[PDB]
Structures are given as structure tokens and as C-alpha cells.
Ligand binder design. Structure first.
Ligand SMILES: Nc1ncnc2c1ncn2[C@@H]1O[C@H](COP(=O)(O)O)[C@@H](OP(=O)(O)O)[C@H]1O
Length: 322
């Protein structure tokens, strides 16, 4: 296949890259371009470099994992499609949001025949690729992008708990404290996390008309103004009639944690139906809170990561942005 040709082409290169143990005993992460990768994800990056073609009308969802990706896939899909479906007919009621917004470095690489990637109408894509490594076609298209980030303490806990749920990996996971130590040293997939955020922040600073820079915690506290802003930014702003008819509030409720978690499609061990999964859909909806780290980390571990944040973000403007 075309992806198998990519894998062969970069085999020798990827073998020359530095390698490290991950959070599972047998897991090997590879370093490239300041960031750590699973092998297949780095193959997926090069495949996208060589083959992904962005259009100016595309809209790209960007995040580091466990900062709000599922939520933004739902929101962007609902914003785009709200006039295509009667409320009860919305496909989000029936299928996990990841089925509707394909990943550049995963779905486009590993699963290029899924229906949404064959749909010439679809404008929505997502990625965890660091900003400095995005394919030139994406950079050159001028397509707009949204980036979301989250408190590193909550982001870490979201990841460590999620990884207990991966198929055929029971017991294969480092302790909380050892996992936290490698997260803080920047050893995580797509990490270092703080470098990931800073990369998009600097892009936002340089191109503030092209990137909407969002924070999980402020959206969670007060989602309606942010959803309206996102829809506007996307080019699908809510009209005055729509606001009269509560349509923006309907989108917020449909994409809320409380709705999606309780859908039949996202419960139990049910998996997505478009392509193979190593997670049940239910693994994407855990607690949805701000501050759950308080139940796992000591003041000493909090001070460590909070000190890393102050040092990484010093003099950048990031923590001031509202
Ligand atoms: N619709 C939604 N609104 C808000 N948070 C959501 C959400 N759907 C999922 N989440 C939360 O977002 C995190 C997953 O991030 P991602 O989608 O990037 O993998 C999890 O956080 P918690 O593990 O803290 O519950 C998950 O519960």
C-alpha cells in the first residue's frame, strides 16, 4: 500500500534516531524534531509530509492528547452539520466523535479507506503533530486551526488513567509516580507536553487570525461564549434567528461531557465501527472535571510540574492570554 511504501522509505532513517523506554515495559519511543513518538506515529507523520494535501477551506483541530480533543471533534462536527440534520438525526448521537474528524497522522496513514476520508465534502481534520512539524501543505494552505491545552497536572492524570484501558495492555504500565517522573522529563508520546503547547502559542502569536487558542478549563467553566466564537472563527457563525431559537445552546448540550458519556454508542466495551480500535469509546469519557489531579498528586509533585511550567512559559505571554 502507499503507507507500506512510506514505512519502507523511512525504515533506515527511523532506525538511526535516538530511542527510549516509554511508560510500558516493552514500549520504545523514538525522538524526532524535539518530540517523542511511537514508531507508527512517526511513520504517519512522514506519510502526511509526503502525501497529505490540505485545502484553504479545511479546519484543523490541534491538541496534545487528553487536553480536550474528543470535545473539540464533537463541537466542530456539530457546528458544521447542525443544519444538515434534524436534532434527533444527528450522527453524533450514534457514533463516537472520533469517527467524524480523522487524524492526519493516524487515520490518513493507517486507515485511508474510512468513509470520511473518501468524502470530498469533509473539511474537518485533527492532529497531535507539533506545530513546527506540520506538513507544508497544511502550513501553505492557510487553513484555519484551533489549538486547545489543559493544566499539565490534569493532562497527566487523564493520560495515566486512560492508558489502563488500552486493549491487550493490562498490567503493562509504570506506577503513577514513575509515570509522572517521565512526564515531567518530557518523555511521553508527542511530548514534551509543555514544548507542544509553546509551539502552538508561538504560532498563534505570529498568525493570530489563523489560530484560535483555547484552554480546557476556561471553556469548561463557561462554554457558550467559546462555542459561539469557535463557530464564527470557523466561518459557520450562529445567525440572529439561530440565537433566538437556542441553537448555540443546543450545540453545547449535544457536545457536552454529560451527553456524550451517556450515549449508548459510548458505553461499556463498545468500540468505534469505522476502523480498528485499541480503546472502547467509553475510555474517552472518564470524569470530565477540572482539578482531579488533587486526588492523585502530592504538594511535592505539584510543585515540581508547576515549577516546570513557570520556567517554560516565563516571558512568553502564554499565562496572560484570556
Ligand atoms: N465533551 C467533553 N467535554 C469535556 N471534557 C470531555 C468531553 N469528552 C471528553 N472529555 C474529557 O477530555 C479528556 C480526553 O481528552 P482527549 O479527547 O484529548 O483524549 C478526558 O478528561 P478526564 O480523563 O480528566 O475525564 C475526558 O473525560
Amino acid at each position: 500500500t502507499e503507507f507500506e511504501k512510506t514505512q519502507k522509505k523511512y525504515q533506515d532513517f527511523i532506525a538511526t534516531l535516538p530511542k527510549s523506554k516509554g511508560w510500558r515495559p516493552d514500549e520504545i519511543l523514538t525522538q524526532y524534531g524535539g518530540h517523542w513518538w511511537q514508531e507508527c506515529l512517526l511513520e504517519g507523520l512522514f506519510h502526511a509530509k509526503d502525501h497529505f494535501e490540505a485545502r484553504p477551506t479545511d479546519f484543523l483541530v490541534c491538541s496534545y492528547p487528553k487536553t480536550g480533543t474528543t470535545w473539540l471533534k464533537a463541537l466542530t462536527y456539530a457546528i458544521v452539520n447542525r443544519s444538515r440534520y434534524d436534532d434527533a438525526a444527528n450522527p453524533l448521537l450514534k457514533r463516537n466523535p472520533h469517527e467524524f474528524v480523522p487524524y492526519v497522522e493516524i487515520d490518513f496513514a493507517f486507515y485511508p479507506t474510512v468513509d470520511v476520508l473518501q468524502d470530498r465534502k469533509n473539511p474537518l481534520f485533527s492532529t497531535h503533530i507539533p506545530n513546527g512539524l506540520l506538513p507544508d501543505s497544511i502550513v501553505n494552505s492557510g487553513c484555519k486551526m484551533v489549538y486547545i491545552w489543559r493544566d499539565p497536572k490534569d493532562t497527566f492524570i487523564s493520560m495515566w488513567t486512560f492508558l489502563h484501558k488500552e486493549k491487550s495492555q493490562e498490567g503493562q504500565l509504570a506506577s503513577l509516580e514513575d509515570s509522572f517522573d517521565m512526564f515531567c522529563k518530557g518523555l511521553s508520546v508527542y511530548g514534551p507536553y509543555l514544548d507542544h503547547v509553546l509551539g502552538y502559542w508561538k504560532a498563534y502569536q505570529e498568525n493570530p487570525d489563523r489560530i484560535l487558542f483555547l484552554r480546557y478549563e476556561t471553556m469548561r467553566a463557561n462554554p457558550l461564549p467559546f462555542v459561539k466564537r469557535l463557530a464564527e472563527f470557523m466561518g459557520y457563525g450562529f445567525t440572529d434567528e439561530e440565537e433566538e431559537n437556542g441553537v448555540a445552546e443546543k450545540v453545547v448540550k449535544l457536545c457536552s461531557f454529560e451527553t456524550l458519556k451517556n450515549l449508548e454508542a459510548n458505553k461499556g466495551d463498545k468500540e468505534r465501527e469505522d476502523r480498528p480500535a485499541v480503546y472502547a469509546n467509553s475510555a474517552y469519557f472518564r470524569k470530565g472535571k477540572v482539578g482531579d489531579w488533587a486526588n492523585y498528586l502530592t504538594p511535592e509533585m505539584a510543585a515540581r510540574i508547576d515549577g516546570l511550567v513557570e520556567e517554560k512559559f516565563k516571558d512568553t505571554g502564554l499565562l496572560q492570554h484570556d
